[PDB]
Each structure stands twice: as structure tokens, then as C-alpha cells.
Design a protein around this ligand. Structure first.
Ligand SMILES: O=c1[nH]cnc2c1ncn2[C@@H]1O[C@H](COP(=O)(O)OP(=O)(O)OP(=O)(O)O)[C@@H](O)[C@H]1O
Ligand SMILES: O=c1[nH]cnc2c1ncn2[C@@H]1O[C@H](COP(=O)(O)OP(=O)(O)O)[C@@H](O)[C@H]1O
Ligand SMILES: O=c1[nH]cnc2c1ncn2[C@@H]1O[C@H](COP(=O)(O)OP(=O)(O)O)[C@@H](O)[C@H]1O
Lengths: 300, 315
């Protein structure tokens, strides 16, 4: 019984809508492939109850899903079953603009109208690039994109698969950009429960990441693709888990789930698990090489 | 997997709507009591898809369900599972303004906005009546009420359980109102396949129904209670619907079907208006009898003439 009980009502609508749209899709056959119109399609639902079912939902709200068929296909190509996606969103309210599902499997990012337009401009090429990868890629894995309307105000959301592990506590996080600029953790951010250490502090800390080659074979392909689409401003996200810090076990992960995880070599000083993926690709060619250059020199 | 294919877009929308509201309702807990708000409540849904899922449904439609908690309670009080109700509407398109679900269990009547308003003004007394008679009534058993919007046009629909069996063929039917006036079926009507006969057609045929004492008296007690209730609401124009099933004729027809390649027994949990004919009766028959057309000569007077007529309708 899905009472859509959430820490605030926009999350109740998120849960209701993902539930609703995924059930509707279970009544829509999967095609022999996608058509152009699938890349221009949307679904729209306006809910207007009166004295009914108001305990957790609002009485009036809207939900819009951009390109349901394309995103259902992507979900398939990334190895995610729709009912799993549905349960990760609906079984308990998402948690903390960036959210995660209760099981930390997927992350929900608030985006702008500009970003939604940008994904529409990239979508057919993104999808064919993922067809040609057989999904073996470091780009964000886009699972769904929604517009919610609560109390008159529209909110746009993109759902991705999580870079970090949904089970293993992550001990240090870095947001690398490869720039010839000055990205460093702010003193306010440096005092966070878990800091986000941008580019400079990765070399001012001295962390290396020890292991090998298939990774760069995939990354070069990715950033070539992003530059060739005039995308800039993207970051690479690195997460460090210290096994030693510490049923189930330490350093133990499922690679079918934590798709980006990577075990450290025996030669590493500490026993570690790394997680690595590209993020924030909704906005040029120089940016590619510089960026690649930086990460060219993270691995040992 | 449910395509909702139907001969008309409105039926498709009806199937979608019953599916949607029943599944929504399954996420809503079943209340201890009903509250008064529940009798003014409604659920609205407005769909505008674009290049998406338009094989069977329209891109744009609306669906409204009246007092859904109240009709869910009613369903439960008439022994009808919600899951079953949605399957009868959604597994296959309803058929032939009157429709029936494919499995012939439920009847869907297009009605008027005034009918919806009348249902609203009587619903709370109707629900109390059903509660205090435990669903034992010849009145209509109302299961849902909806408003569909297709091509900018609203259509009101009331779902009821069938007076007629979902299995046993009906070979005669009468619509009796007890009126003093000459109710008779037209040449047009009397030329249909299953013509719907009226009062004087019933009398000129000298039809009488032998049900036996026990179920006769159950029927007459039910009917006294029901039409007293109706009269206390200023409701008229309602009829008794009687369908007659000829067991022997059904045996012959079914055998003629089998040749092209129990008997007279029914389930009273399902065919709740069904009565066997007395052990010592001329033909082995099964009747189905109920009150119909409830949303609208004094009302006390209509009650009186009606009851005195239907009292003599059977032996
Ligand atoms: O709660 C009620 N107590 C009494 N009477 C009611 C109630 N609820 C509806 N009627 O009852 C017909 C339904 O029609 P409707 O109401 O579904 O139409 P809406 O009001 O949403 O207005 P619209 O969308 O066309 O702008 C009209 O006679 C009206 O009265
Ligand atoms: O998939 C994720 N899992 C966990 N945290 C993430 C994930 N994606 C982004 N983050 C966190 O939120 C931050 C915002 O990243 P992003 O570059 O997409 O936002 P931006 O447009 O403000 O630059 C990341 O640097 C990191 O702190
Ligand atoms: O429950 C039913 N099962 C089978 N036929 C029905 C049922 N209800 C109504 N009918 C058919 O519809 C006819 C008219 O019904 P009703 O008197 O309620 O509508 P009205 O407002 O047009 O007079 C009935 O006399 C009968 O022919």
C-alpha cells in the first residue's frame, strides 16, 4: 500500500508520478525500436481531487514525463528493471538541490528549463551513443526526466544512476575539472560532514588511485563525444572508500549495482574502493583535452 | 498488459478510468466509518499526452469519479471485490445508452447531469438503507458513477450490477410500472429479438410466475421495504424488471450449439435477483426480478399502485 508519505509534498508528487507513469508504461508494448516522434513525445497528467486522498498527496498537482519511451529504453539498456526503478522511488520518500532514493540507488537532481531543453537537443545522439557502447560508459546514465507542478510552481527533475555506491560509506569525495583555474574547497564546504574537494586539493592532498586501461579507453570515447556535441562545464566525480575504516562485508560490493566501482591494486598503501564517473553534461573542444589531460595523470 | 482496445474512444477511456481509479483506490486505506466529506468528494484526472500512447486512447481526455470512497464501500457491501470489478471492466471492451461488461456481470448506463445530481442528493440515505438491510434489496446496486470527457464532451455513467444472470440466457423480459395507464410495447419493440414488454403485454399474455412460498414472501418483504424507501424520497418512474429463463429451451439451444461441431441452476451470490420456480410448476423456469430507473400521481401513490401490481405478478 503506497501511501506517498514524504518529507515535503513535492516529493509526494515525485513518488506518485513515478509510480503512475511506470504503471502506465507497463501497459505500453516495447517497440521494435524508437521512432523520431518518441524523442519529441511527452506525457501529461493533471490531478484535481476534492475531499479525497489528501492525507499525503496534494489535491491539485501536475506531472509531465519527457520522452517516456526513450527513457524506458535507456532504463533497459542500462540494466535497470522498471519495477526496480519504481520501487526505489516509491517505497519510501527520497532523502537529501540533490536527492537520493531511500536505498541510495538513484539520484534526483533539480534542473532548469534550459537544462531540459539541452537534453532534448542531445537526446537522439546520446541514445545512439549508448546503443553503440552497449551501455559501457562513464557518462551519466539518464533514467527519467520529469516536470512537476505543485502550488503553481514548476520543478524540473532528472533522475540518474548514482556514481557512488548505494551501500558502502564513502570516505572522501572530489569534483575534478581539469582546469587551468582555481577550484578549491571553500572554507565553509571544507567544514562539511563530508567535503567536496575540487581540483586543486586533489594534488595538494597528494592522493593517487592505484590500479587500469579499459577505463581510459572508455573515458576518451566519452569526452570526445561530449566535445563533439559542444558540451562544456562537465566534472568528473571521484569517491574513496577506506575498507580498513569499516550479513555483509568490508570492501564487498556488487558490480552489477555499483557499476562505477573499482577495487584498488595490492600495491595501494591503504585498502580502498574507488568510484568514478562524469557528471553535469547539460550546457568546448579545448575543454575536452585539458579535462582529459588532468585525469590522464590520476591512475597508477 | 492492457491495451484498452474498444470500438469507440469513449469506451477505451472508460476502461482506462475504471482501471486508474481502482488502482488508485488500492493505495487508499479502507476507513473505519465514512465521513460526510466523502459524500461531496470527487476525483478528477486530466490527460494530455503528445506523440505517446495514442494507439487506443485519445491523446487528450478527462475522467471524474464521484464519491469514490462511498461507492467502494458499496461495492464491498454488495459482495463485489474491487479487483473483480476492474477486471470485468478492463479485460475486454464492454458491449451493447446501455452497455454491459464483456462477462455480462455489470451494466453501464449513460445518464444525465440531473441524474448525477439526484444520485448525489439521495446517496447518504441510500447508503444507510443498504447498511441497515445488509444489501438485501431489489433496488439498483450502485457500484460507480463517472464523468468522461472525450473531444470536449462530457458523458455521465452509472455502473450497476446486472438484474439478469451473467450465464443463463433470458428468453422473455417485462418492464412493469404498475401504472393505471396503458403501457404496451410498440410494434417496433415487439419486432426486436428480445423485445422488452410492458405491463399490458404482461397481462394480455396471462403470465404468472410460480416461485413457491418461501421466496415469494422474501420477495414481497424486500419489495415493501424498497418501495417505501423510494416513496419517502419523492422518486418515481421506476420499473420492475422481470426476465424469464426457460431451462428446457436453454438445454435445447445449448445442445444445438454443441451439435454444430447444473441445468437451470444458478449461484445466488452472483445472480442475486434469481429465483427458481416452485417444485410443482408447469415449466422449469428461472426468474430475475429487480427495481430499476431510480433517479428522478403522488410518490406515495406510485408506491401504492406499483406494489399492488407486482404483488399479483406472481404466485
Ligand atoms: O456534491 C454534489 N451535491 C449535489 N449535486 C452535485 C454534487 N456534485 C455534483 N452535483 O450534478 C451535476 C454534475 O455535473 P458536474 O458537477 O460533474 O460538473 P462540475 O460541477 O465540475 O462543472 P463543469 O466541469 O462542467 O465546469 C450538475 O448538475 C452539478 O450540480
Ligand atoms: O550521482 C551523484 N551521487 C552522489 N553525489 C552526486 C552525484 N552527482 C552529483 N553529486 C554531488 O552534487 C554535486 C553537483 O554536481 P554537478 O556538477 O552536476 O552540479 P553543478 O551544475 O552545480 O556544477 C557534485 O559535485 C557532488 O557534490
Ligand atoms: O440491469 C439490467 N439488465 C439488463 N437490462 C437492463 C438492466 N437495466 C435496464 N435494462 C434495460 O433498460 C431498459 C430501461 O431501463 P431504465 O427504466 O432504467 O431507463 P430509462 O430512464 O430509459 O426508462 C430496461 O427496461 C431494460 O430494457
Amino acid at each position: 500500500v503506497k501511501l506517498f508519505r514524504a518529507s515535503e509534498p513535492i516529493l509526494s508528487v515525485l513518488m506518485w508520478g513515478v509510480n503512475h507513469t511506470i504503471n502506465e508504461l507497463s501497459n505500453v508494448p516495447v517497440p521494435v525500436m524508437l521512432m523520431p516522434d518518441d524523442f519529441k513525445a511527452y506525457s501529461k497528467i493533471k490531478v484535481d481531487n476534492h475531499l479525497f486522498n489528501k492525507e499525503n498527496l496534494p489535491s491539485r498537482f501536475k506531472f509531465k514525463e519527457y520522452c517516456p519511451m526513450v527513457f524506458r529504453n535507456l532504463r533497459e539498456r542500462f540494466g535497470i528493471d522498471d519495477q526496480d526503478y519504481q520501487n526505489s522511488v516509491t517505497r519510501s520518500a527520497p532523502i537529501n538541490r540533490f536527492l537520493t532514493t531511500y536505498d541510495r540507488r538513484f539520484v534526483i537532481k533539480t534542473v532548469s528549463s534550459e537544462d531540459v531543453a539541452e537534453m532534448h537537443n542531445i537526446l537522439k545522439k546520446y541514445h545512439q551513443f549508448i546503443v553503440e557502447c552497449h551501455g559501457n560508459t562513464l557518462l551519466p546514465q539518464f533514467l527519467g526526466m520529469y516536470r512537476l507542478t505543485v502550488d503553481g510552481v514548476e520543478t524540473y527533475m532528472v533522475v540518474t544512476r548514482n556514481v557512488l555506491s548505494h551501500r558502502l560509506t564513502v570516505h572522501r569525495k572530489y569534483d575534478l575539472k581539469g582546469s587551468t583555474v582555481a577550484r578549491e574547497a571553500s572554507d565553509k564546504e571544507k567544514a562539511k560532514d563530508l567535503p567536496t574537494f575540487k581540483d586543486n586539493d586533489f594534488l595538494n592532498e597528494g592522493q593517487k588511485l592505484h590500479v587500469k586501461k579499459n577505463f581510459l579507453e572508455k573515458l576518451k570515447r566519452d569526452v570526445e563525444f561530449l566535445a563533439q556535441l559542444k558540451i562544456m562545464d562537465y566534472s568528473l566525480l571521484v569517491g574513496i572508500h577506506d575498507v580498513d575504516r569499516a550479513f555483509f562485508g568490508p570492501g564487498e560490493f556488487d558490480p552489477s549495482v555499483d557499476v562505477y566501482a573499482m577495487k584498488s591494486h595490492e600495491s595501494s598503501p591503504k585498502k580502498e574502493v574507488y568510484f568514478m564517473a562524469i557528471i553535469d553534461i547539460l550546457t568546448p573542444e579545448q575543454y575536452s583535452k585539458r579535462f582529459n589531460e588532468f585525469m590522464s595523470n590520476i591512475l597508477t
